[PDB]
Design a protein around this motif. Structure first.
Motif, PDB file in Angstrom:
ATOM      1  N   UNK B 100     -18.126  28.020 -24.709  1.00  0.00           N
ATOM      2  CA  UNK B 100     -16.937  27.386 -24.107  1.00  0.00           C
ATOM      3  C   UNK B 100     -16.325  28.201 -22.954  1.00  0.00           C
ATOM      4  N   UNK B 143     -15.998  26.173 -33.561  1.00  0.00           N
ATOM      5  CA  UNK B 143     -14.591  25.761 -33.462  1.00  0.00           C
ATOM      6  C   UNK B 143     -14.439  24.569 -34.384  1.00  0.00           C
ATOM      7  N   UNK B 147     -10.678  26.494 -36.504  1.00  0.00           N
ATOM      8  CA  UNK B 147      -9.533  26.051 -35.701  1.00  0.00           C
ATOM      9  C   UNK B 147      -8.166  26.440 -36.281  1.00  0.00           C
ATOM     10  N   UNK B 151      -5.489  28.262 -34.236  1.00  0.00           N
ATOM     11  CA  UNK B 151      -4.164  27.657 -34.031  1.00  0.00           C
ATOM     12  C   UNK B 151      -3.044  28.662 -34.274  1.00  0.00           C
ATOM     13  N   UNK B 154      -2.970  30.937 -31.086  1.00  0.00           N
ATOM     14  CA  UNK B 154      -2.409  30.180 -29.949  1.00  0.00           C
ATOM     15  C   UNK B 154      -0.898  30.089 -30.065  1.00  0.00           C
ATOM     16  N   UNK B 175      -8.559  25.413 -20.027  1.00  0.00           N
ATOM     17  CA  UNK B 175      -9.594  26.091 -20.810  1.00  0.00           C
ATOM     18  C   UNK B 175      -9.485  27.613 -20.759  1.00  0.00           C
ATOM     19  N   UNK B 177      -6.790  29.346 -19.989  1.00  0.00           N
ATOM     20  CA  UNK B 177      -5.543  29.810 -20.600  1.00  0.00           C
ATOM     21  C   UNK B 177      -5.649  29.884 -22.124  1.00  0.00           C
ATOM     22  N   UNK B 178      -6.345  28.929 -22.731  1.00  0.00           N
ATOM     23  CA  UNK B 178      -6.430  28.860 -24.189  1.00  0.00           C
ATOM     24  C   UNK B 178      -7.509  29.736 -24.800  1.00  0.00           C
ATOM     25  N   UNK B 182      -9.329  32.075 -28.926  1.00  0.00           N
ATOM     26  CA  UNK B 182     -10.650  31.792 -29.475  1.00  0.00           C
ATOM     27  C   UNK B 182     -11.465  33.066 -29.609  1.00  0.00           C
TER      28      UNK B 182
END
Lengths: 328, 331
Positions: B100, B143, B147, B151, B154, B175, B177-178, B182
């Protein structure tokens, strides 16, 4: 009022011609929401209907943010209409439970969100949705099934843009910034290969939503063809007028809460037979007797239905079983 | 040079006392990376060892960004060490393939990323990793398994903060930023319930990483206890020195050619110690006689890897990537 909104969001009104089309396509009268013009505007609906009349399938996508409460009467509209669309067109319905969104927005512990989400799922199953064609999912569980389609939207959206729509501050957590793509993802049939196989390509999506939310969503609609996806159709509802009344309320509370334009509107939403609305639309307290009677039933019926919803039903509706066009 | 970095990151040096500890704990000599001080600094390693000596398990977590190429020699270090740690301590190893991340960073089509990731996975399996205790995963597939733990991170990170570390622009896509969360997620045992059951609680994580990446990661370490998680241990490597590169797919000729035109390289790759000491001495050895030794030792590594890669099969990939019950899920 609304015709002005149609013009500058730019949208399309639902005219008489489109009502006659819905009628000959289904072989019935349209739902009272359409006849009475509660669902009044749309995008790409004619395209969707072309698709259907050609023998292609489409699907429905509504969502539900978990609350630590029971649904307000006004929350029923899209479910009432969805359920009708589904029964009528014999199409799949995808219901997204945004448990991750509640978690990211409020500072609540995950196990409390998950627990309230379970209860909101029960409220929905109690509406009589056919589990042969309805798929309720929890973002926390179903993310990962759909992460690839999510990823394609995250990469398409820029921080600046989502800031622009949603007004996120830098001091807002990363969960909030990333969520818009998660909400977008279900608009696209790729998100559900267990119901639409990728070897059959794109299946049209129809989203019922109140007109106010449209401005978020021009974002997700315009980026579809860049992904080779199908810009999803939308059907727009009018505002539900407040006063609130909840599905768990007893006769006494419904009677009390209700006791003038607003209530006549409530009957426009909930009373089924048309001539009795017209008769009414011609004392203030005799009106309220009718509204309390018709609401009481809806609630009583829902309460009576909810108490039979079981934990296996929740697992059943949430499971990723083969559905719809995966009949192969 | 490095002692200055330890001070202002702030970290902990790996002293002689800790080397003696590793030795009596394992019943062997430490790996040459530790003896030669290539892996030289650490955080919470003593805590991890306390945990181990008590009969608790721990695990390893390294990652790999997919490239449309073959690993450089210098990319082997953390895998070489990881594989040793794993063989020695008999512990699980979790390898993250950030497919990703590549997708979000470069403008590449997903099916091209996924295809290169498969090839990077084969390069790893060809290192000899034990599939009983090693779990390679694709973010795109795994993922959702994890998750919930993603979460939680995040929600813990703010946009301001991740901007602060990683320097993301507003014109950068969501993508990017997040992604930091991960990458954080595997630092925590909750990310792998198929290997660490949630009824047993937190299992210690050890991350081998070059000292440069530490400043990203104070973020993910300090937020652990607010989640009730275990701030993960880290062991730090020294920089690998370039050439102004050599790849695992290279032939003898190319390895020979690339080198001509190094003592440090031998510090990384030559196994027996006295022959390094002999070299590290003898106005006797000419520059070119050194290069002969390096080319010989590298050639084997590569040749061995090439020979091993050609037996890695599509079922091996599926096997290493599957979510089978592993480690402490022996119940």
């Amino acid at each position: 009022n609304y015709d002005k909104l149609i013009k500058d969001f730019g949208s399309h009104a639902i005219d008489e011609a489109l009502l006659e089309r819905i009628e000959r396509v289904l072989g019935k009268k349209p739902h009272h929401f359409l006849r009475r013009g509660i669902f009044f505007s749309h995008r790409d609906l004619n395209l969707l209907l072309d698709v259907y009349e050609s023998g292609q399938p489409f699907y429905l996508y509504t969502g539900r943010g978990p609350s630590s409460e029971s649904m307000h009467m006004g929350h029923l509209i899209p479910f009432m209409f969805t359920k009708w669309l589904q029964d009528s067109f014999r199409v799949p319905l995808v219901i997204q439970m945004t448990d991750d969104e509640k978690f990211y927005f409020r500072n609540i512990p995950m196990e409390q969100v998950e627990a309230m989400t379970t209860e909101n799922i029960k409220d929905i199953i109690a509406m009589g949705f056919d589990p042969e064609l309805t798929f309720i999912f929890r973002d926390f569980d179903y993310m990962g099934c759909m992460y690839r389609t999510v990823a394609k939207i995250e990469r398409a959206f820029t921080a600046s843009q989502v800031r622009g729509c949603f007004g996120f501050a830098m001091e807002d957590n990363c969960g909030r910034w990333m969520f818009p793509a998660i909400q977008a993802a279900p608009s696209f049939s790729a998100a559900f290969p267990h119901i639409f196989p990728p070897s059959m390509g794109n299946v049209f999506c129809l989203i019922p939503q109140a007109i106010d939310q449209d401005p978020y969503f021009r974002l997700t609609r315009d980026i579809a063809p860049r992904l080779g996806y199908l810009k999803p159709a939308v059907i727009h509802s009018k505002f539900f007028p407040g006063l609130a009344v909840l599905l768990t309320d007893t006769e006494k509370m419904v009677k009390d809460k209700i006791n003038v334009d607003v209530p006549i509107q409530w009957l426009s939403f909930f009373l089924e037979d048309d001539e009795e609305l017209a008769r009414v639309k011609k004392m203030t307290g005799e009106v309220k007797k009718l509204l309390i009677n018709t609401i009481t039933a809806i609630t009583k019926t829902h309460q009576e239905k909810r108490k039979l919803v079981t934990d296996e039903d929740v697992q059943l509706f949430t499971s990723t079983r083969i559905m719809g066009p995966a009949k192969k």
